[PDB]
Design a protein around this motif. Structure first.
Motif, PDB file in Angstrom:
ATOM      1  N   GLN A 147       0.842  -1.250  -0.123  1.00 53.43           N
ATOM      2  CA  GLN A 147       0.004  -0.027  -0.014  1.00 53.43           C
ATOM      3  C   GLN A 147       0.753   1.209   0.082  1.00 53.43           C
ATOM      4  O   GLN A 147       0.423   2.325  -0.443  1.00 53.43           O
ATOM      5  N   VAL A 148       1.986   1.169   0.524  1.00 54.33           N
ATOM      6  CA  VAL A 148       2.895   2.305   0.500  1.00 54.33           C
ATOM      7  C   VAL A 148       3.979   2.177  -0.556  1.00 54.33           C
ATOM      8  O   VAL A 148       4.282   1.129  -1.121  1.00 54.33           O
ATOM      9  N   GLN A 149       4.309   3.240  -0.872  1.00 56.21           N
ATOM     10  CA  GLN A 149       5.690   3.382  -1.915  1.00 56.21           C
ATOM     11  C   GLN A 149       6.996   3.215  -1.346  1.00 56.21           C
ATOM     12  O   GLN A 149       7.166   3.575  -0.160  1.00 56.21           O
ATOM     13  N   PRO A 150       7.787   2.621  -1.796  1.00 55.69           N
ATOM     14  CA  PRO A 150       7.734   2.244  -3.137  1.00 55.69           C
ATOM     15  C   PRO A 150       7.146   0.999  -3.714  1.00 55.69           C
ATOM     16  O   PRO A 150       6.709   0.673  -4.619  1.00 55.69           O
ATOM     17  N   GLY A 199      -0.521   8.183   4.200  1.00 54.47           N
ATOM     18  CA  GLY A 199      -0.758   7.029   3.496  1.00 54.47           C
ATOM     19  C   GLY A 199      -2.019   7.107   2.615  1.00 54.47           C
ATOM     20  O   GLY A 199      -2.943   7.947   2.896  1.00 54.47           O
ATOM     21  N   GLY A 200      -2.345   6.521   1.570  1.00 55.72           N
ATOM     22  CA  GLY A 200      -3.550   6.764   0.898  1.00 55.72           C
ATOM     23  C   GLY A 200      -3.800   7.993   0.159  1.00 55.72           C
ATOM     24  O   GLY A 200      -2.930   9.053   0.101  1.00 55.72           O
ATOM     25  N   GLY A 201      -4.884   8.058  -0.431  1.00 53.73           N
ATOM     26  CA  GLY A 201      -4.996   9.110  -1.690  1.00 53.73           C
ATOM     27  C   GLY A 201      -5.906  10.311  -1.390  1.00 53.73           C
ATOM     28  O   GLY A 201      -5.564  10.838  -0.418  1.00 53.73           O
ATOM     29  N   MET A 202      -6.891  10.451  -2.519  1.00 55.72           N
ATOM     30  CA  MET A 202      -7.636  11.598  -2.116  1.00 55.72           C
ATOM     31  C   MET A 202      -8.726  11.138  -1.116  1.00 55.72           C
ATOM     32  O   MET A 202      -9.447  10.327  -1.021  1.00 55.72           O
ATOM     33  N   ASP A 203      -8.888  12.333  -0.383  1.00 59.27           N
ATOM     34  CA  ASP A 203     -10.212  12.284   0.444  1.00 59.27           C
ATOM     35  C   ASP A 203     -11.267  13.401   0.182  1.00 59.27           C
ATOM     36  O   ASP A 203     -11.017  14.416   0.741  1.00 59.27           O
ATOM     37  N   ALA A 217     -11.353  10.151  -8.858  1.00 59.16           N
ATOM     38  CA  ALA A 217     -10.259   9.454  -8.935  1.00 59.16           C
ATOM     39  C   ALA A 217      -9.196   9.529  -7.752  1.00 59.16           C
ATOM     40  O   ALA A 217      -9.410  10.691  -7.064  1.00 59.16           O
ATOM     41  N   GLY A 218      -8.407   8.760  -7.598  1.00 57.99           N
ATOM     42  CA  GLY A 218      -7.574   8.821  -6.499  1.00 57.99           C
ATOM     43  C   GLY A 218      -7.914   8.426  -5.145  1.00 57.99           C
ATOM     44  O   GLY A 218      -7.182   8.596  -4.241  1.00 57.99           O
ATOM     45  N   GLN A 219      -9.209   8.058  -5.053  1.00 57.47           N
ATOM     46  CA  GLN A 219      -9.844   7.825  -3.586  1.00 57.47           C
ATOM     47  C   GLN A 219      -9.440   6.318  -3.092  1.00 57.47           C
ATOM     48  O   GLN A 219      -9.042   5.566  -4.099  1.00 57.47           O
ATOM     49  N   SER A 220      -9.273   6.124  -1.961  1.00 51.32           N
ATOM     50  CA  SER A 220      -8.929   4.643  -1.381  1.00 51.32           C
ATOM     51  C   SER A 220      -9.617   4.536  -0.044  1.00 51.32           C
ATOM     52  O   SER A 220     -10.244   5.330   0.409  1.00 51.32           O
ATOM     53  N   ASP A 221      -9.642   3.082   0.247  1.00 52.85           N
ATOM     54  CA  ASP A 221     -10.182   2.710   1.758  1.00 52.85           C
ATOM     55  C   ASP A 221      -9.474   3.466   2.748  1.00 52.85           C
ATOM     56  O   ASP A 221      -8.053   4.063   2.303  1.00 52.85           O
ATOM     57  N   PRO A 222     -10.018   3.987   3.908  1.00 57.20           N
ATOM     58  CA  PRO A 222      -8.998   4.766   5.222  1.00 57.20           C
ATOM     59  C   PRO A 222      -7.504   3.912   5.072  1.00 57.20           C
ATOM     60  O   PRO A 222      -7.721   2.472   5.259  1.00 57.20           O
ATOM     61  N   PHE A 223      -6.510   4.514   5.302  1.00 58.05           N
ATOM     62  CA  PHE A 223      -5.365   3.640   5.186  1.00 58.05           C
ATOM     63  C   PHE A 223      -5.166   3.560   6.617  1.00 58.05           C
ATOM     64  O   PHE A 223      -5.141   4.214   7.601  1.00 58.05           O
ATOM     65  N   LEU A 224      -4.739   2.245   6.861  1.00 63.92           N
ATOM     66  CA  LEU A 224      -4.485   1.457   8.234  1.00 63.92           C
ATOM     67  C   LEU A 224      -3.215   1.318   8.778  1.00 63.92           C
ATOM     68  O   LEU A 224      -2.864   0.863   9.706  1.00 63.92           O
TER      69      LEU A 224
END
Ligand code: NAD
Ligand code: NAD
Ligand code: 5GN
Ligand code: 5GN
Ligand code: ZN
Ligand code: ZN
Lengths: 301, 301
Positions: free
Chosen positions: A210-213, B249-253, B235-242
């Motif tokens: 889930q994280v880069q890279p 972490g993770g994308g657009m909110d 675009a760019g959304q994801s599940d909350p980053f755990l």
């Protein structure tokens, strides 16, 4: 119309037979926090947020920011003391990678871990890409100085609760881990291109991708290169990719009818490595290696 | 306990007011194939697979592979002829970026497009990072030669169906687009770090944020930097980053109760840019600029 299928089946058994074939000369491991949880180092998915409350930060993520570190380094170093492992015994999984090194199969171990266990297990700097950096070394942050300190020096500062300052210029000395705001290490960018052209097998262990890279690194492998994930849960899958590049886009395909090269072995990393070792005829060598190396560590306490 | 909120609300109107404030000095645009569809250049989401059938490739993705190109270049060049745009008129969206340049607001335009329309619209090499390369220049593939050819030369070879060979050494000459197997351009790696430390606003247009580098580039912005997406769909959304790094972490909110800096304007890129221009008091300047630049192109036909 179809891709070369290097695995005879999508199982650990198919991966083992491929590994024993002439075709499989160069393995790259991508390892994350899951390979060190059995060594007593938590991954923060069974969280930092509680540890952080006491430091009275402007927001929790400020602990990871290089700009916040440089203005207020004390929270980081206090957390570093709380989180510092009480022992450093690499896992079966680390020693599986040492076996790959010693058998000439390891092209590279890319790690997102900062715990130094790869090095303790006997992987050398040339075998490693520490993609999120490492505690192994620390540097003075002043551009004109950059004096390097070893982990024994940093450890002593962390445990004595003395904010580490450079002996040459009195600037802050920061562990070589990648804070937010910092680039990935130069080492990562110089190896990645070349490595991912030559890779015959990608072994992905103890990471959710889930994280880069690592999240994108899996897609740099040649399309025919098999990919084995050893992890507690599936990772790297996505919806079928609908853009221009077709099969080159998106992640692992374990379960569709188009699946041809990716395998998921779900369970403990240590158990997966031992199961793979067993298929390969390496189980006694791995068990012997773990026993002697753990004993060598126990003999110095 | 909370992040600085630079937008007064999560709307195009809030973005406009932020843009007009002293705080917003450096805008980075991330643009993809969606900004050129209104210029008559399809994005391959309304597919290449049909075009590819006639070439009798081993599999469709072989068309993107640098190793396959070097052994069998004819399919690429035949496809390049089929796909070559019949005209090159940048869109309202491209000229919106030219306005940002001319008003001193454009830190950088990162593009995944290879169509050269940014350059035609008057963005200069120093304004641009062509992250997937470009047809603008081509190079001899021989390491000791690397002779550069302009698009007018490559075009003539493509249209005459003559496989382009170098005039100095007779090696293949390849357009400077990033084939699979190749690194992203050096230019990308030298700008990214510095740029994403200094960015006050990230404008993301005409991309689903699924391919690299854009998929992960959005997360390199400072946590307080607002992010506007202008696109047909979210675009760019994801599940909350755990994982460990939490909000980093993770994308657009856009839509959770934790949303604080990301805005999605759904529709045509040209309409979004015109709507933003209008809020800013730039609608007449943008309309005048498009009219004159399109006329200048029409006057040379
Ligand atoms: N040991 C360390 O150095 C350490 C510890 C904690 C966090 N981190 C940092 O946090 C980030 C972690 O990212 P990541 O993608 O590597 O890890 P991650 O956040 O995905 O967490 C580990 C993954 O491994 C799985 N897992 C945990 N224990 C396992 C076991 N015994 N066997 C099999 N699977 C197991 C989890 O379910 C999860 O999928 C990195 O930035 C890393 O530097 C490092
Ligand atoms: N013009 C070009 O240079 C061109 C054309 C086709 C493909 N490509 C290549 O394909 C890849 C495309 O990746 P990407 O992420 O940039 O694009 P992408 O694959 O996400 O497709 C474009 C996105 O923009 C949306 N869209 C299309 N037209 C739009 C419009 N008029 N207004 C608003 N949104 C619109 C689509 O719904 C989609 O979300 C890149 O590798 C790129 O080089 C380039
Ligand atoms: C040798 C040694 C020393 C220490 C403190 N531990 C470890 S492993 C255990 C552990 O989780 N320690 C950790 N230390 C800091 C952690 C969180 C964090 C904070 C600020 C910047 C960071 C930048 C990059 C990364 Br990745 C993590 C960062 S998490 N091994
Ligand atoms: C100046 C000019 C010339 C051409 C042929 N077109 C264009 S824009 C239109 C278009 O979609 N053309 C395209 N040409 C090739 C395309 C697909 C492809 C094949 C092989 C390697 C590739 C490597 C990187 C990329 Br990104 C795309 C690649 S898609 N502008
Ligand atoms: Zn110093
Ligand atoms: Zn040449």
């Amino acid at each position: 119309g179809h891709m070369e299928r290097l695995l005879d089946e999508l199982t650990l058994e198919g991966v083992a037979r491929y590994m024993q074939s002439e075709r499989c000369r160069r393995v790259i491991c991508l390892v994350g926090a899951g390979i060190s949880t059995s060594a007593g180092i938590p991954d923060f998915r069974s969280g930092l947020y509680d540890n952080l409350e006491k430091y009275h930060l402007p927001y929790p993520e400020a602990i990871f920011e290089i700009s916040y570190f440089k203005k207020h380094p004390e929270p980081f170093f206090a957390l570093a003391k709380e989180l510092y492992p009480g022992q450093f015994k690499p896992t079966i999984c680390h020693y599986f990678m040492r076996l790959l090194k010693d058998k000439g199969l390891l092209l590279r171990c890319y790690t997102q871990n900062i715990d130094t266990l790869e090095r303790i297990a006997g992987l050398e700097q040339e075998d490693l890409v520490e993609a999120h950096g490492t505690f192994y070394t620390s540097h003075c942050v002043s551009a004109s100085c950059r004096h390097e300190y070893p982990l024994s020096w940093m450890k002593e500062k962390i445990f004595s609760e003395v904010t580490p300052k450079c002996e040459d210029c009195q600037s802050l000395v920061k562990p070589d881990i990648v804070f937010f705001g910092e680039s990935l290490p130069a080492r990562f960018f110089s190896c990645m291109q070349s490595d991912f052209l030559k890779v015959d097998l990608l072994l992905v262990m103890g990471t959710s991708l889930q994280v880069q890279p690592f999240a994108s690194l899996i897609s740099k492998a040649p399309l025919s290169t098999p990919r084995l994930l050893i992890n507690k849960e599936k990772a790297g899958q996505s919806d079928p990719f609908l853009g221009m590049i077709m099969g080159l886009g998106g992640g692992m395909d374990f379960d569709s009818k188009k699946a041809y090269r990716d395998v998921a072995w779900l369970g403990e990393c240590d158990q997966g490595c031992l199961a793979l070792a067993e298929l390969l005829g390496w189980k006694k060598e791995l068990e012997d290696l773990v026993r002697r190396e753990h004993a060598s560590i126990d003999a110095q306490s």
